[PDB]
C-alpha cells in the first residue's frame, strides 16, 4: 500500500538520518567549530532524504515533526503513530549499524544528546522548543503548497532549517530537535539522562510551531 | 612540627595542584591539541609547587607518589597516610574552590578522568601504570641526591615528566597519574565510574616504578 511504502520510507529515511547525522557527530579528528560540519551533516542528510522520500511519506523522519502534522491535522492519529514507531525503529537501527561500522575508539557517546554544562533543563527545554519551533514552522511553510514560484528547493529549505537549529542549539543541547535522533543513542548507550528534555522540547516546539503557523501566520 | 608543616604543605600544594591543573582542563574555548596546554598546566603547576613545598614535604601532592616513597622505604607508614589524607583533602578542596570561582557553563565535568571511548579498563590501567611508572621513576631519580652537576632544576624535571605523562595519556585516560587528582572531581561530580582504574593504575605504576628504580636501575 501507499501507506507501508510510506511507513517503510520513514523507517529507512530515519535509519539513514541517524546513521549519517549521528555518524558525522562521531567527532573523529574534527577540532573547533566542528558544529559547522555536523550541522551541514544533519542538514544535508535531511535535504537528501527529503529528496528521496519526500513524496513517499513527507519525510518527517522526526517524531516531533509527525506530531506537528498530527496536531496540524494533516495525519490520522493512526498514521502519526506508525511514523513515530517506524522513525524510532529506523533510528535505533541506523544507530546500531553506525555502531557496527564505527571503531569503538571513535563512536564515543554515539553522539548522544546531553545538555551542555551550565544549561538547566528548563533552558535546555526552551532551546529545544525553539530549535524545533522554527524547524517545524519552516516545514509547515515550505510543504504548504499554497505558495510557489520564488520558493525554491523544498528539501534544501527544510534541511538548512535543520542546519540552522544545529548551528545554534548544538552548543546548548547538542541540538536534538528530533525525539528519534535523541532516542536511538540513548537506548543503545542505555543513557537516558535528561532524555525527556529531548521529547518535551521538540514536541512542544513542534506543536507550538504547528499552531503558530496554522491559526496565525498563515491560517486555513 | 616539621611534620604538620609538611602535612599542611601537602594539603595546600595539592589544593593548588588540583585548582590549577584541573582549572586549566576546564576547556573554555581551547579547541584542538588542547592537550598541549593542559599538560604544560599540570606540569608547571607541579614544578612550581615542588619549588615552594619541595623542601617542606617532598611535594608528593600525589597519593601514588607518596606510595612509591612508602614502598621505596622513605616514609613511615604513618606519614604516608597523613600525606594521602592531606592530599585527598587538599584535592577535594582545590576542586571545590575551582568550582566556586568557575562559571557553571565552563566547569563541565570538572575535568573528571574518564577512559577515552574504545579504551578498555585493562588498557586504561596499563596506560596509567606507565604514565605513573615513568613519572615516579623520574622523581625517584631527580630526588635521589646521589646525583648532581649536570642534573638541573629538580622541579622542572619532575614537572615535565608530569607533562610527558599528559602529552601521552591524556588521550587514553585523561591522564590521571594521581589518585588525588582523579578523586577530587569524582567525589564532587559524584561520578566514580571506572574510578578504580585511577588508583590501581597509579598505585601499581608508582610501586613498580619505585622498585624498578631501587632494586634495579640504581639500587641502594
Ligand atoms: C538482515 C537480514 C538479511 C535478510 C534481508 C532480507 C530483507 C527482506 C525485505 C524484502 C521484502 C521485499 C520488498 C517488498 O516488496 O516489501 C516491502 C513491504 C511491502 O508492503 P506492502 O504494503 O505489502 O506493499 C508495498 C509495495 N511493495 O513494505 C513494507 O511493509 C516494509 C515496511 C518497513 C518495515 C519497517 C517497520 C516499520 C514499523 C511498522 C509500524
Ligand atoms: C537485510 C534486511 C535489512 C532490513 C532491516 C534492517 C535490519 C535491522 C538490524 C540492524 C542491524 C544490527 C546491527 C548489528 O549487527 O550489530 C553490530 C554488532 C557489532 O558488534 P561486534 O563487532 O559483533 O562485536 C564487538 C564487541 N567486541 O555486531 C555486528 O557487527 C554484526 C554484523 C553482522 C552484519 C550482517 C548484516 C546482514 C546482511 C546479510 C544480507
Ligand atoms: C510562548 C508559548 C507559551 C504557551 C505554552 C507554554 C510554554 C510551556 C513551557 C513552560 C516554560 C518553561 C519554564 C522554564 O523556562 O524554566 C525555567 C528555568 C529556570 O532555570 P534557570 O534560571 O535557567 O537556571 C537556574 C539554575 N542555576 O529556565 C529559565 O528560567 C528559562 C527562561 C526562559 C524564558 C523564555 C520564555 C519564552 C518567551 C519567548 C516569547
Ligand atoms: C499529563 C502528564 C504531564 C506531565 C508533565 C511532564 C513534563 C516533563 C516535566 C519535567 C519534570 C522533570 C523535572 O524535575 O524538572 C523540573 C524543572 C525545574 O526543576 P529543576 O531545575 O529540576 O530543580 C528541581 C527543584 N528543586 O522544571 C522545568 O523547568 C522543566 C520545564 C518543563 C516544562 C513542562 C511544561 C508542561 C507541558 C507544557 C504544555 C505546553 C503545551 C504545548
Ligand atoms: C508532556 C509532554 C509535552 C507535550 C505537550 C504537547 C503540547 C504542545 C502544544 C501543541 C498542542 C496540541 C493540541 C492539538 C490542538 C489542535 C487541534 O485543534 O486538535 C485537532 C484534533 C482534534 O482531536 P479530537 O479530540 O479527535 O477532535 C475534537 C473535536 N474537534 O486533535 C488532533 O489532531 C489530535 C492531537 C493529538 C493528541 C494531542 C496531544 C496531547 C498532548 C501530549 C501529552 C501526552 C500526555 C497525555 C497522555 C495521558
Ligand atoms: C514559548 C515559545 C514561544 C512561542 C510562542 C508561540 C505560541 C503559539 C500559540 C499561538 C497559536 C495561535 C492561537 C490559536 O488560534 O490557536 C489556538 C488553538 C486553536 O484550536 P482550534 O480548536 O483549531 O480552534 C480554536 C479557536 N482559535 O487552540 C488550541 O488547540 C490550544 C490548546 C491548548 C494547548 C494545551 C494542551 C492541552 C492538552 C491537550 C490534550
Ligand atoms: C574559611 C574560614 C575562614 C577562616 C580562616 C582562618 C584560618 C585559620 C588558619 C590559621 C592557623 C594559624 C597558622 C598556624 O601557625 O598553624 C599552622 C599549623 C600549626 O601546626 P604545628 O605542627 O602546631 O606547627 C606548625 C608551625 N606553625 O599547621 C597545621 O597543623 C596545619 C595542617 C594543615 C591542615 C590540613 C589537614 C591535613 C590532614 C591531616 C591528616
Ligand atoms: C580560611 C581558611 C582556609 C583554610 C582551609 C580551606 C577551607 C576549606 C573549604 C573549601 C571552600 C568551600 C568551597 C565553597 O565555598 O563552595 C562554593 C559554593 C558555590 O556555590 P554557590 O555559588 O553558593 O551556589 C551555586 C548554586 N546556584 O558556595 C560558594 O561559592 C560559597 C563561597 C564562600 C567563600 C567564602 C570564603 C571564606 C573566606 C573568609 C575569610
Ligand atoms: C611488568 C611488571 C609485571 C609485574 C606486575 C604484574 C602487572 C599487573 C597488571 C596485570 C596485567 C593487566 C591485564 C591487562 O592488560 O588487561 C587486558 C586487557 C584486555 O582487553 P583489550 O584486548 O585491551 O580490549 C578488549 C575489549 N574489546 O587489555 C590488554 O589486553 C592490554 C594488554 C597490554 C599488555 C602490556 C603488558 C606490559 C608489558 C610491558 C613490558
Ligand atoms: C586484596 C584485594 C585485591 C583485589 C584486586 C582489586 C584490583 C581491581 C580489579 C578491577 C576489577 C574490575 C573489573 O571487573 O575489571 C575486570 C577486567 C577485565 O574484565 P572486563 O574488561 O571488565 O570485562 C568483564 C568480563 N566479562 O580486568 C582487567 O583487565 C583489569 C586489570 C586490573 C589488574 C589488577 C591486578 C591485581 C593487582 C596487581 C598486582 C601488582 C603488584 C604491584
Ligand atoms: C589492589 C590495588 C593495587 C595495589 C597493589 C600494589 C602493587 C604495586 C607494586 C608495589 C609493591 C609494593 C610492596 C612493597 C615491597 C617493598 C618492600 O621491601 O617492603 C618494605 C616494607 C617492609 O614492610 P614490613 O612488613 O613492615 O617489614 C617486613 C620485614 N622486612 O614495606 C613497606 O614499606 C610497607 C609497604 C606498604 C604496604 C604494601 C602495599 C600493599 C599493597 C596494597 C594493596 C591494598 C589491599 C590490601 C588490604 C587488604
Ligand atoms: C607492567 C609494567 C612493565 C614494567 C615492568 C617492571 C617491573 C618492575 C619489577 C622489577 C623490580 C626489581 C626486582 C627486585 O629486586 O625487587 C623485588 C622486591 C625486592 O624486595 P626486598 O624485600 O627489598 O628484597 C628482595 C630481594 N631482591 O621484592 C618485592 O618486594 C616484590 C613483592 C611482590 C609484589 C606483589 C605484591 C604483594 C602484596 C604485598 C602485601
UniProtKB/Swiss-Prot annotation, chains A, B:
Record keywords, A-Z: Cell junction, Cell membrane, Eye lens protein, Lipoprotein, Membrane, Phosphoprotein, Repeat, Sensory transduction, Transmembrane, Transmembrane helix, Transport
UniProt-annotated location(s): Cell membrane; Cell junction
Motif segment (NPA 2): 178-180
The keyword Lipid metabolism is assigned to this record: no
Topology Cytoplasmic: residue spans: 54-57, 71-79, 142-151
GO biological process: gap junction-mediated intercellular transport; homotypic cell-cell adhesion; lens development in camera-type eye; maintenance of lens transparency; visual perception; water transport
Highest taxon above the source species: Eukaryota
Membrane topology: Multi-pass membrane protein
Tissue: Detected in eye lens (at protein level).
Chief location: membrane
Any one GO cellular component localisation term in the record: plasma membrane
NPA 1, short sequence motif: residues: 62-64
Extracellular side: 25-34, 101-120, 170-171, 188-194
Reactions catalysed, as given in the entry: H2O(in) = H2O(out)
UniProt intramembrane stretches: 58-70, 172-187
PTM text: Subject to partial proteolytic cleavage in the eye lens core. Partial proteolysis promotes interactions between tetramers from adjoining membranes.
Transmembrane segments: 7-24, 35-53, 80-100, 121-141, 152-169, 195-212
Residues flagged as site, Important for water channel gating: 143
Effect of residue 143 to S: Decreased water channel activity. Loss of inhibition by calcium
A GO molecular function held by the record: structural constituent of eye lens
Record-stated family: Belongs to the MIP/aquaporin (TC 1.A.8) family.
Oligomer status and interactors: Homotetramer; each monomer provides an independent water pore. Two homotetramers on opposing membranes can dimerize, forming a cell-cell junction. Interacts with CALM; the calcium-calmodulin/CALM complex interacts with the cytoplasmic domains of two aquaporins, leading to channel closure. Interacts with BFSP1 (via C-terminus); prevents calcium-dependent inhibition of the water channel activity.
Domain notes: Aquaporins contain two tandem repeats each containing three membrane-spanning domains and a pore-forming loop with the signature motif Asn-Pro-Ala (NPA).
Listed name of the protein: Lens fiber major intrinsic protein
Lineage: Eukaryota, Metazoa, Chordata, Craniata, Vertebrata
Gene of this entry: MIP
Residues of the full protein shown: 7 to 226 of 263
Amino acid at each position: 500500500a501507499s501507506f507501508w511504502r510510506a511507513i517503510f520510507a520513514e523507517f529507512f529515511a530515519t535509519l539513514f538520518y541517524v546513521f549519517f547525522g549521528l555518524g558525522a557527530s562521531l567527532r573523529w579528528a574534527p577540532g573547533p567549530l566542528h558544529v559547522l560540519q555536523v550541522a551541514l551533516a544533519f542538514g544535508l542528510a535531511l535535504a537528501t532524504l527529503v529528496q528521496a522520500v519526500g513524496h513517499i511519506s513527507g519525510a518527517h523522519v522526526n517524531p516531533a515533526v509527525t506530531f506537528a502534522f498530527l496536531v496540524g491535522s494533516q495525519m490520522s492519529l493512526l498514521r502519526a503513530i506508525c511514523y513515530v514507531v517506524a522513525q524510532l525503529l529506523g533510528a535505533v537501527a541506523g544507530a546500531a549499524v553506525l555502531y557496527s561500522v564505527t571503531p569503538p575508539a571513535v563512536r564515543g557517546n554515539l553522539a548522544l544528546n546531553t545538555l551542555h554544562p551550565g544549561v538547566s533543563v528548563g533552558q535546555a527545554t526552551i532551546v529545544e522548543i525553539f530549535l524545533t519551533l522554527q524547524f517545524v514552522l519552516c516545514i509547515f511553510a515550505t510543504y504548504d503548497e499554497r505558495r510557489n514560484g520564488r520558493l525554491g528547493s523544498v528539501a534544501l529549505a527544510v534541511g538548512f532549517s535543520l542546519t540552522l537549529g544545529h548551528l545554534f542549539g548544538m552548543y546548548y543541547t547538542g541540538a536534538g530537535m528530533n525525539p528519534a535522533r535523541s532516542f536511538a543513542p540513548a537506548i543503545l548507550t542505555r543513557n537516558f539522562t535528561n532524555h525527556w528534555v529531548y521529547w518535551v522540547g521538540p514536541v512542544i516546539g513542534a506543536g507550538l510551531g504547528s499552531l503558530l503557523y496554522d491559526f496565525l501566520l498563515f491560517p486555513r
